[model samples]
Target: TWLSDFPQAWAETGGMGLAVRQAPLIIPLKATSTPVSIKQYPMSQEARLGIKPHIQRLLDQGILVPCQSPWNTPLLPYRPVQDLREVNKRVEDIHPTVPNPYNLLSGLPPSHQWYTVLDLKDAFFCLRLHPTSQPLFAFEWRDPEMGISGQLTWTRLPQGFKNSPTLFDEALHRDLADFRIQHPDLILLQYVDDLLLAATSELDCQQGTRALLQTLGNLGYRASAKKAQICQKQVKYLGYLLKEGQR
Candidate 1:
C-alpha cells in the first residue's frame, strides 16, 4: 500500500533491480562540514543512534561502493577523493532560471539590490521514498523491537541519500519552471540546504516566494512556517555570506 504512493519512483527502483534491505543506505539530515561541524555538534538520539547501523548495513551488503567519475573530477577542490563530475550528474536537475552561479555572489545590477530567502520544510522527507529503501529507513533509531537491535526501517522523509539534494531540487525545479516565466526578473538561488530569493524590492521577493510556494504546493512539496523566514537584506546562503558587496 505504501509503495503505491509514488508509482513512478517504485517503477524506477524496480527497473534498477534494487532491493529494500530493511536498513537504509542513505543518511538523512547530515550536518555539512562547514561552520555547523556535524562532527562537533550533537545529533539527536535518533540520528546519533542510526548512523552506525546504516553504515554497517551498506558495508555488509556491498552497497557502499566507491564511485569514480570521468577524469576523476573533484567538486570541492579540497576533497580529491570525492568526485565532482559524479556530483554534477547527481544534481543534474538544478538548472536555475536566474543563473545564480555557484558561489559567484557578485555581479548585481544597481536595481537588483534587496533580497530574501525561503527554505522548504522537510524537503527530502516530503517525498515518498522508494520501497526498496523504505524498510531500512523505517527501522528503529533506538531500542530493539521484537528482539532486533538498532533496527531502523524506511521513512517518508528524505534520508541521507547520496543523490537527495539534487533530486529534490530537480523535482521542485520542474514544478516551478512556469513560475520563472511569470516572474522573469527574480533571482532564484539554491544551495543544497539553503534556498535564496534575490530581487530588486520587497514586493518582487514576496511575489517570487509566493510563486515558488504555490508551485511546490501543487507538486506536493512542503514549506515550513517555523523554519521559513524572510530577511530584507544580507542573507546567509549555503555557507557564504551574501550581500550586494559581500560575496
Candidate 2:
C-alpha cells in the first residue's frame, strides 16, 4: 500500500541517480602512477550475460567509459565491485567517517517512539569519481556476441574502492547539512548511506519521512524500497533493533 503511495521515490530495479557535489577526490602524491599490473578474471558465458545489463547501464550513465588500463578485475556478480586490494594498498586510506555501532545508540531521546529508516540505493554509485583517477578502477569485460573485448573504467566511484565510503559519507553529509540544521526536533542518524529519523509522535515521524524523501529525491538520490521503513514504532537501524529507545 505504501509502495503505491510513493511510486516516484522507489528506485528502478537497480538504478541510482548521480549525485552532484562540490568536492573532488584527493589523491596522495605517492599513490600516483604506482604501476599496478594489469589482470582480468575469466567468467562463464552465463555470468557474462547476467552482468551485461548492469555494465551497459553504467556505460549509459557515463559513469563508465571504454578504456585501456593496467588494472582490471573480473566481471562477475559476486565481484562486480572489483578486487582493489593492490589499489587500496597504494592509495592513502581516509579516516572512516562511518559512525561506530556502539556510539550510534547513545544520546537518543528516551521518548522517541516512532522511527523511519532510509537506505540509499546503490549508495556508492551516486558520487562521481575524479577524471584523472578513474583508470585506477578499470575492469575487463568481453562481449561474446560481438566478439570484442576491452577494458572499461568507472567515471563514477565504483564499489570496492578503499576510499569510497569516506568520500560518499562526506558528500552526503554536505548535501543534508541544511536538513539537519532545520530539523533539530528529529533525531537523525547517518551511518554512511543509511539514514534514520526518529521522533516522539507518529505525525512528526510521518512528516519528517515525507520531507526526507522529498529532500533525497530533489538531490538525485533514490531510496531502496525493500530497505526503506517509514513511520514505525519499532524498526531496525544500523543492524540493531530499535523500539522506543530500548534497543
Candidate 3:
C-alpha cells in the first residue's frame, strides 16, 4: 500500500528532457545593449533557510545546476512568494497570464476561427478577503449609525493595487481549471478577466461560450452576457480586431 502511494516520481534522479533533432535555433534580436553585471540580491533569513535545503537537494540530485549570469532580479520572498506558496499548493499550477501579445495569441490555429469575448465584472471585488486583512484597506466614510465619519473597508479583494492583476488572473484561472480539463477542443485565453474564446466553427464557439458562461457562474464569477461578443468571425479585443487567425 505504501509503495503504491509514494508521490516522488522524479526523485530517483533519472529525470531529464529529451533533445530535439535538427531545427533552426531562432535566437531573439535584442534591441538593448549587453546585459549589466548586477550582483545577486541578498537573501532573506526565512527564505534562505528553506532555499538552502532545496538548492542543495536539487543541485545534488542534478535537477539544478550552477550557472553565472550578468543580470539579476531580487528574489521576492517576503509576502507573496513565501506565504502564497502555502495557499497555492491546494490548487493546480498555471503559467501566470501577462499582457504579452505573442504568447497569448501564438497558439491560435489557422482556421475559420469563431471568436467570443467575455468580460468579467470586478474580478477582484468578487474575491473574498479575510476579516483581519480588511482594516488595512479602510478609508474614512460616513456611516449610517455614526454621526461622525468613520472608516470603512472591503471584505473583498480591492482592485487598483499592486499584484491585483496577477492575483485575480490566478484566482480566475484556478476556478476555471476544471472547465479547461473538460473542454480541450476550445482555445480559451484569459488576460486579467478579459477572456477570448476561439473555436473553428460558429456552433462550436456558441456552445463553448455557453459552457464558459455556465462554468464561470458555478464558480461564483459572473461573465457579462450582455456585453460579451457572442460567436463571431471577427471581433475587437484589446484594441485589435482579431479577425480569423491574423491577430
Best-performing candidate as measured by lDDT: 2
Residue-level lDDT tens digits of model 3 in 1-247: 2112221111122122111111211112134433332233455567655555644453364333333333222323322221222222222334455657567777678774899887776565566554544433333222223353332334455443445577677767777788889988888888887888988888898777777765665555655545668788888877678874786
Model 1, span 1-247: residue lDDT tens:
3223332222222221122222232323223311110112333455544554654554454433232212222111111122223323333243343334553355445466566655665455454454443432222222334343332333343344456666566555655667768888987666543566778777777666666655545555544444555646776665666666466
Give the distance in Å from residue 9's predicted Cα in candidate 1 to where it truly belongs. 24
Candidate 3: Cα lDDT at 74? 30
Ten-residue stretch with the least lDDT total in model 1: 71-80
Relative to the true structure, candidate 3 reaches a TM of 0.58
Q: List model 2 lDDT by residue over 1-247, tens digit each.
A: 5566555556853256667554545555244546475556677777777778878887887877998886665544522556777777777657787778678778577878789988888777777767777777787878989977888988777777777777888888898899889888898887888888998789999888887877777777788888888898889887788864786
| Candidate 1 vs. true structure, TM-score | 0.50
Best-performing candidate as measured by TM-score: 2
Tell me how candidate 2 scores on lDDT.
Answer: 0.76
Question: Could you tell me every candidate's TM-score relative to the true structure?
Answer: 0.50, 0.88, 0.58
Q: Local error of candidate 3 at 42, Å?
A: 42
Candidate 2 regions exceeding 4 Å error are 1-8, 13-15, 22-33, 74-81
